[PDB]
Amino acid sequence: STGSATTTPIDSLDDAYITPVQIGTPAQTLNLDFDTGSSDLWVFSSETTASEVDGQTIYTPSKSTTAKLLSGATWSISYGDGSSSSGDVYTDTVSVGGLTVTGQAVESAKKVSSSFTEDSTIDGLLGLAFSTLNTVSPTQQKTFFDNAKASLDSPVFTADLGYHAPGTYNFGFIDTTAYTGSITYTAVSTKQGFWEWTSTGYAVGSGTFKSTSIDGIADTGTTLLYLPATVVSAYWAQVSGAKSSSSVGGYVFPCSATLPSFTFGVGSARIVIPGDYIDFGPISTGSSSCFGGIQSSAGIGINIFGDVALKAAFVVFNGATTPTLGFASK
Numbered sequence: 001s002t003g004s005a006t007t008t009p010i011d012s013l014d015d016a017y018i019t020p021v022q023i024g025t026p027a028q029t030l031n032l033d034f035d036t037g038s039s040d041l042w043v044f045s046s047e048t049t050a051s052e053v054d055g056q057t058i059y060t061p062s063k064s065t066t067a068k069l070l071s072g073a074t075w076s077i078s079y080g081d082g083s084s085s086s087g088d089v090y091t092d093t094v095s096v097g098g099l100t101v102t103g104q105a106v107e108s109a110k111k112v113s114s115s116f117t118e119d120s121t122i123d124g125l126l127g128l129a130f131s132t133l134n135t136v137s138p139t140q141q142k143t144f145f146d147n148a149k150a151s152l153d154s155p156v157f158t159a160d161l162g163y164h165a166p167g168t169y170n171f172g173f174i175d176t177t178a179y180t181g182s183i184t185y186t187a188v189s190t191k192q193g194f195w196e197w198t199s200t201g202y203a204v205g206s207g208t209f210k211s212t213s214i215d216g217i218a219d220t221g222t223t224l225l226y227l228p229a230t231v232v233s234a235y236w237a238q239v240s241g242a243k244s245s246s247s248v249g250g251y252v253f254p255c256s257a258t259l260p261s262f263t264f265g266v267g268s269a270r271i272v273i274p275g276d277y278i279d280f281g282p283i284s285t286g287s288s289s290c291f292g293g294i295q296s297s298a299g300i301g302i303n304i305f306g307d308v309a310l311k312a313a314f315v316v317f318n319g320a321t322t323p324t325l326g327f328a329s330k
Helices: 144-151 229-236
Strands: 003-009 017-023 029-037 041-043 070-076 086-096 101-110 124-127 156-159 167-172 184-187 196-204 210-218 224-226 242-246 252-255 264-265 268-272 279-282 291-292 295-298 303-305 314-318 325-330
Touching: 003 086, 017 167, 029 041, 041 086, 070 101, 086 242, 196 229, 210 224, 229 252, 229 295, 252 295
Parallel strands: 029 124, 041 101, 210 303, 224 295
Antiparallel strands: 003 017, 003 167, 017 029, 017 086, 041 124, 070 086, 086 101, 156 167, 156 314, 184 325, 196 210, 196 264, 224 303, 242 252, 252 291, 264 268, 279 291, 314 325
């Protein structure tokens, strides 16, 4: 089998992407944030504290003839951005772009943190990291991909995120029309439960390529590109008027400045992030100070190839017995 679904930016800055997901019978369609940095499929629901729901579409398990309580199960997650949610668990039928999994754990939120409430466009998350990170207790549950894998034509999914435009998540096949050149595959460590890999280096604009190992994760659920402070400083040094602002919480720059591209290495291949992808707009409405899309990972504890990086590539998440990652230009 295969599936194919369009993913759509939530706003004009590509702060996140939402993908429609059918849950239950009859289908309830919720717009979920596909997150290769986590491993829980959780949704706003009829069980979510009323004061914490503000515009989201909810899953109501009592209206699904295929929903079954996963008795005794609870879940609770905290994300890198300080947000959190928790609740109980049902199993139900979940379909993405024509691909159906029966018996998928659907984690129903009883509580969500303020950032989730405040984002009316995201009805929940669909985790696509390794199932070892799933938070359901006492019995850890499998991701949608893990459940689908054996049925897929090939045990892979791909992320093709757009810049200020929709893109595509495919399951079970590689669309050879969606990228230019070849796909370069690179080793993955699953030891932390992430799609963790090692970039071979970077360049800033037309500068020479610096060969240096950068371990990080391919994370569709993180907006920006977070890299070591040395790398990030080298980038912003090439932008007139850029500075790191402790009050704002990262590098900012005047919108009158031209942003150079940023290149990252995948083996001997190179992915070029155009300068425009690194502009995240005014820090506040009407400000001449713009927020940068490349920021320091210092104090995160890991480098993160988030959407800024991934949207410059066609990315293969290969779930073969030994997982790997593939990157192509597009």
